Structure 1
Amino acid sequence: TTPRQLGIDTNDLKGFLGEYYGQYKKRSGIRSNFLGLDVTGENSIIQPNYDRKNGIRDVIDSLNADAGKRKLINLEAKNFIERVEKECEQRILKK
């Protein structure tokens, strides 16, 4: 047997994968308090850690890489078919 092509749908990158990185980009959990209190994030037993790279990060990165690889494979197939068409057209012309 050989490994199968599995991963997140290439049409749904904006979503489960998109939101995961969007949260770390926003870093909204360490914004200033709305009342002006000196307290903020990182001042509780449960606090945000936006500089973290462990946990499900590895799984998300693997899924994103697999989706990118599948998209690259599709693009290469499209280029191959276009090249074949061009070569056949050139061969027809050169006769």
Structure 2
Amino acid sequence: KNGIRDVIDSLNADAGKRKLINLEAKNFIERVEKECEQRILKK
């Protein structure tokens, strides 16, 4: 578990974090769209 293992693990963790950030951004845009739709309907 030594050598380039640490670098590979760090790269994998960073890639996972970036994917999570993209997914959270997608969830945010969906939530904003839903909130706007509900506000329009409730008027």
Range into which the TM-score falls when normalised by the shorter chain: over 0.9
In 1, distance between residues paired with 2:9 and 2:38? 43
Describe the superposition over 1:15-52 as per-residue Cα deviations: whole angstroms up to 9, x where unpaired.
xxxxxxxxxxxxxxxxxxxxxxxxxxxxxxxxxxxxxx
Q: CA RMSD in A?
A: 0.0
- Tell me the CA shift for residue 66 of structure 1: 0.0
2:15 aligned partner: 67
Per chain length, whose mean CA-contact separation is higher, i.e. which structure has more relative contact order (CA < 8 Å, sep 6+)?
1
- Tell me the CA shift for residue 92 of structure 1: 0.0
In 2, distance between residues paired with 1:61 and 1:90? 43
Q: In proportion to residue count, which structure has more helix?
A: 2
Which runs of at least 4 in structure 1 moved beyond 3 Å after TM superposition?
A: none
Structure 1 or 2, whichever has the larger Rg, is: 1
Point out where structure 1 has 5 or more consecutive residues left out of the alignment.
1-52
In 1, distance between residues paired with 2:38 and 2:27? 16
Percentage of pairs with the same residue = 100
In 2, distance between residues paired with 1:80 and 1:54? 39
Tell me how many residue pairs correspond in the alignment: 43
TM superposition score normalised by structure 1 = 0.45
